[PDB]
Design a binder for this molecule. Structure first.
Ligand SMILES: *C(=N)CNC(=O)[C@H](Cc1cccc(C)c1)NC(=O)c1cc(C(C)(C)C)nn1C
Length: 220
């Protein structure tokens, strides 16, 4: 792979969103990955509806504001034959009945790919595909209060992930030979969290916080 990647500078990534108090992180991770893949396909970045996923992807196994999986979201888009734009189907931060309208569909997918559970494979996928949906262990105060720098939490688990986010790149800080490496991660807690809503997360430390344990992307 390249030494560094940042898909934001290539037009693949919408601004940071805010999921509010709803457990819909999975929907934000999924829309982020599909926003990227649709851009790869068409050259047009269009913000997609998390609310559409929250309201409508129960049949695939999702549980709305009570949680879900990005792969189930990708399966919904495939089964449904579409996903509405954010503009047409705006975010309300609470579960409502499904009001999908095919007139306003701006995305589709033909399934998904689950990435092997290690960081070399994740790096390959980030470099060659685009932004990647991942889950992390975000269950520490250190994550809530994260400001800047490369996040490393001694108590992070590589197995207990609770939060879906989006890897939009990776790179290094300091002298290259110091191996001070990170994943560049878009969160859905607004721009006031973290570094404008982003976090740099420890890379190549044996799957810190489980970032490579549940990584996937939609096939477009
Ligand atoms: C975010 N606001 C709430 N978190 C979730 O919805 C997590 C995200 C997650 C965690 C681990 C792996 C992935 C790919 C995503 N969802 C879950 O923990 C979750 C939901 C479910 C079902 C829908 C099957 C009950 N299972 N898990 C593990």
């Amino acid at each position: 792979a390249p030494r560094s990647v940042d898909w934001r500078e290539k037009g693949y990534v919408t601004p940071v969103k805010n999921q509010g108090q709803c457990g819909s992180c999975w929907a934000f991770s999924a829309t982020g990955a599909l926003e990227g893949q649709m851009f790869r396909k068409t050259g047009r970045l269009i913000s997609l509806s998390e609310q559409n996923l929250v309201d409508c992807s129960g049949p695939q196994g999702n549980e709305g504001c009570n949680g879900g999986l990005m792969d189930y979201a990708f399966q919904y888009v495939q089964d449904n034959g579409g996903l509405d734009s954010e503009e047409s189907y705006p975010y309300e931060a609470t579960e409502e009945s499904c009001k999908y309208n095919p007139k306003y569909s701006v995305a589709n997918d033909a399934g998904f790919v689950d990435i092997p559970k290690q960081e070399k494979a994740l790096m390959k996928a980030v470099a060659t595909v685009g932004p990647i949906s991942v889950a992390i262990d975000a269950g520490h105060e250190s994550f809530l209060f994260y400001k800047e720098g490369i996040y490393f939490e001694p108590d992070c688990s590589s197995e207990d992930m609770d939060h879906g986010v989006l890897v939009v790149g990776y790179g290094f800080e300091s002298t290259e030979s110091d191996n001070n490496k990170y994943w560049l991660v878009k969160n859905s807690w607004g721009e006031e969290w973290g570094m404008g809503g982003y976090v740099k997360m420890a890379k190549d430390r044996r799957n810190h916080c489980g970032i490579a344990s549940a990584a996937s992307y939609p096939t477009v």
